[PDB]
Amino acid sequence: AEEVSNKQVILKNYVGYPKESDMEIKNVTIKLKVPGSNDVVVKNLYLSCDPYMRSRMRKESFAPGSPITGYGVAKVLESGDPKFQKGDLVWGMTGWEEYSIITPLFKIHDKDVPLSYYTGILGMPGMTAYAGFHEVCSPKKGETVFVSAASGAVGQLVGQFAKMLGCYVVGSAGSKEKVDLLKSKFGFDEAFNYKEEQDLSAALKRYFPDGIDIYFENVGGKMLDAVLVNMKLYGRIAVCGMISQEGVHNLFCLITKRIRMEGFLVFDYYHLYPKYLEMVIPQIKAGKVVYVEDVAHGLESAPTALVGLFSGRNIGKQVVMVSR
Amino acid sequence: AEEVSNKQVILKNYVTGYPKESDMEIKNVTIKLKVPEGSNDVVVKNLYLSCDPYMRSRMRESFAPGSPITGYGVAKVLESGDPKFQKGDLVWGMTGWEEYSIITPLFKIHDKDVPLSYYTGILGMPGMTAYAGFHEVCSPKKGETVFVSAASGAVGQLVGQFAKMLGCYVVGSAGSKEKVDLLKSKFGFDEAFNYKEEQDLSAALKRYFPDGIDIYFENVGGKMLDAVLVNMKLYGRIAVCGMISQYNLEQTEGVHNLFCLITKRIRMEGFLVFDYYHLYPKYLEMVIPQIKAGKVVYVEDVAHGLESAPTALVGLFSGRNIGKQVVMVSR
Numbered sequence A: 001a002e003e004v005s006n007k008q009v010i011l012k013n014y015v016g017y018p019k020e021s022d023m024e025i026k027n028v029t030i031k032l033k034v035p036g037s038n039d040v041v042v043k044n045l046y047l048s049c050d051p052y053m054r055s056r057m058r059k060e061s062f063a064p065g066s067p068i069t070g071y072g073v074a075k076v077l078e079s080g081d082p083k084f085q086k087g088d089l090v091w092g093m094t095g096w097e098e099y100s101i102i103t104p105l106f107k108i109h110d111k112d113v114p115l116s117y118y119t120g121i122l123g124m125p126g127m128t129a130y131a132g133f134h135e136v137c138s139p140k141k142g143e144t145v146f147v148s149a150a151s152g153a154v155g156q157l158v159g160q161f162a163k164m165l166g167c168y169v170v171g172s173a174g175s176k177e178k179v180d181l182l183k184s185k186f187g188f189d190e191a192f193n194y195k196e197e198q199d200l201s202a203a204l205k206r207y208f209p210d211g212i213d214i215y216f217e218n219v220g221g222k223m224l225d226a227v228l229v230n231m232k233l234y235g236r237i238a239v240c241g242m243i244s245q246e247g248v249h250n251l252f253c254l255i256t257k258r259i260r261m262e263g264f265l266v267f268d269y270y271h272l273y274p275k276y277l278e279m280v281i282p283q284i285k286a287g288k289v290v291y292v293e294d295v296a297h298g299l300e301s302a303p304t305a306l307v308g309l310f311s312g313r314n315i316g317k318q319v320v321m322v323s324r
Numbered sequence B: 001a002e003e004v005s006n007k008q009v010i011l012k013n014y015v016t017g018y019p020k021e022s023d024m025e026i027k028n029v030t031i032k033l034k035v036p037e038g039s040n041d042v043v044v045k046n047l048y049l050s051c052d053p054y055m056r057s058r059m060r061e062s063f064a065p066g067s068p069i070t071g072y073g074v075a076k077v078l079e080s081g082d083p084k085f086q087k088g089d090l091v092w093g094m095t096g097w098e099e100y101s102i103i104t105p106l107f108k109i110h111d112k113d114v115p116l117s118y119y120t121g122i123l124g125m126p127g128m129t130a131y132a133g134f135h136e137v138c139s140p141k142k143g144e145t146v147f148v149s150a151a152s153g154a155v156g157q158l159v160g161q162f163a164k165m166l167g168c169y170v171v172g173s174a175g176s177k178e179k180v181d182l183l184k185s186k187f188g189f190d191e192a193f194n195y196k197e198e199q200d201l202s203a204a205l206k207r208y209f210p211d212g213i214d215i216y217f218e219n220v221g222g223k224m225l226d227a228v229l230v231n232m233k234l235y236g237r238i239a240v241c242g243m244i245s246q247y248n249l250e251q252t253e254g255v256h257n258l259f260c261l262i263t264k265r266i267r268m269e270g271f272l273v274f275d276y277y278h279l280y281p282k283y284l285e286m287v288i289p290q291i292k293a294g295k296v297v298y299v300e301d302v303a304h305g306l307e308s309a310p311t312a313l314v315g316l317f318s319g320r321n322i323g324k325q326v327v328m329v330s331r
């Protein structure tokens, strides 16, 4: 059994405005051995920085003194689990460290796409966009679609999925750079900077003169109130996230417009993952669906990457490359 | 043609905040009971008028000051330029708040072995609302837990019975002890409470639903909706029927707990009874026999005469109605 140094990113204390100083790099030794258990021993390759991670920094929560955990991409080294062997590439819950021992996780089968994608378009955020838009929104060709946080990991896919259906798509984001990207790279019909608008309702009016069939909700609050008054009869709202979290005032619109507003969790849809891959892999290979990610290098960079994600300093999907 | 005086309830002006009696008045005019030439109009004598909460929204599509209020009623046909209706037919539909109306292009009533007043409630729009809302929007299943607000009202008292009939566990809220007693002794709710006597509505619902709520039939909105959200089960459903606590506010109360839709995967869906009238033949064919057999029951509050109508309508918003509020026009 190989015994190796193992760098780790440790939660120093519960978090307040998350800062780099609440994490800490620690250097330990690890013996790369299956414990008599069903554990998988992996070398981590990529780590996802995901918004839900913030709530886990307070007290299912992270433990101070212990490594941070989250979605990543890793190589199997040893396995007591029948489903995985040495050399398998996998994605799932792993540790923020060079090597992890994982308890009883998806086998990667296509190595022809950059492997970082299995933290985003081919991982949890991609499955999130697929379940939310294709299942929860019941979309039809020619319908109008608004996407909140449109340049994030999830929303940049929702808009391309809608485009591919023949929908008219508008997105909102937090900078000129992000807006230009929405239009020029993701093929959104329109986009605006929400920070610039003094009246979100009037602005959605201008982009949707006939109303909105589908809102993919990443935000909540005032944005949700502005959407509600601009929805079409029988409009659908897929409640994915509420990252901005402020009272919502316009729920009466659910009756007058007969709107179905429905929350969902990506874990409930994992039986549809092979089918999602079946659709999106050849779209990617043909350049008809695209993805933009931010890749920080080395674990020494992971605290900075996680903190910057919480503010939106990243462009699209934030990833840390642990090792090549 | 026959000429008779025609008493009318007139809306005096648009309303801010709560409506009061003096926002309406009684006017007497002369009406000629005849079908306007070339029209397919129907001339009716009004018998029962429904008081319905959505009528508040029309006091700010909207009613016109100086003109009769209009709403759902039950009437007897006197003359008709429409071949579908004959003199002597009984109908229910939109009519005027008056002794007689000329109605331009209505459901023809066939069963008169039930009180005619029931076609303002259990056999009219509110009855269809409870059925469409509960049977269609809530996708209910045997053994599920069901919470209904404004539960002793026109729509609520039916939702609760339909839920018990399905073998659901059912809890109702109402705004007085008398209404709570009625929920439990007449309508067969498993439990009920007076929302005004609860210090903390969330803690109240947790007491009545130790494992959470599968289905919320929402008639009320506001702080009640927030207390329900944190008590919902996984894949809970909320059929958004009404938000009566909000109707008389100049600014709505903010709803704060929507993040629960995500953690609990909740479907919260609004609906309008109008969209579901294709199901009305079916509803009547199921419910009428159940009423005649005493398996479904009804409580209505019948005010007497058009002079009572302003009071009857205003009292909805104070909880003065016990069960479905009706005005008997004529005797």
Ligand SMILES: NC(=O)c1ccc[n+]([C@@H]2O[C@H](COP(=O)([O-])OP(=O)(O)OC[C@H]3O[C@@H](n4cnc5c(N)ncnc54)[C@H](OP(=O)(O)O)[C@@H]3O)[C@@H](O)[C@H]2O)c1
Pocket: A050, A051, A052, A124, A125, A128, A149, A150, A151, A152, A153, A154, A155, A172, A173, A174, A175, A178, A218, A219, A239, A240, A241, A242, A243, A244, A264, A265, A266, A267, A309, A310, A311, A312, A314, A316, A317, A318, B262
């Ligand atoms: N239900 C589920 O199963 C599930 C699964 C995955 C993710 N989610 C949720 O989906 C949402 C988006 O996830 P993601 O992975 O795609 O995140 P992300 O967009 O990659 O990162 C966060 C983004 O949200 C926007 N944002 C941050 N603060 C904001 C604010 N105050 N107001 C408006 N926009 C703000 C940012 O873009 P701007 O430049 O536009 O500000 C930022 O890029 C999150 O709320 C997340 O928790 C839910």
Ligand SMILES: NC(=O)c1ccc[n+]([C@@H]2O[C@H](COP(=O)([O-])OP(=O)(O)OC[C@H]3O[C@@H](n4cnc5c(N)ncnc54)[C@H](OP(=O)(O)O)[C@@H]3O)[C@@H](O)[C@H]2O)c1
Pocket: A255, B052, B053, B054, B125, B126, B129, B150, B151, B152, B153, B154, B155, B156, B173, B174, B175, B176, B179, B219, B220, B240, B241, B242, B243, B244, B245, B246, B271, B272, B273, B274, B316, B317, B318, B319, B320, B321, B323, B324, B325
């Ligand atoms: N979506 C549709 O197609 C449709 C059709 C019909 C009705 N509706 C809606 O369904 C609901 C019930 O209608 P209904 O005909 O059955 O009325 P109802 O319950 O017969 O009468 C109204 C009742 O609302 C309650 N109430 C009034 N103000 C309140 C407040 N501030 N907070 C809490 N409760 C209050 C009262 O009962 P308590 O004494 O118990 O407080 C009062 O008796 C309404 O919200 C209505 O707008 C919707």
Ligand SMILES: COc1cc(/C=C/C=O)ccc1O
Pocket: A255, A256, B053, B054, B241, B242, B272, B273
């Ligand atoms: C018929 O009953 C209602 C209708 C509406 C909405 C009507 C919009 O066309 C709101 C509340 C009600 O009680």
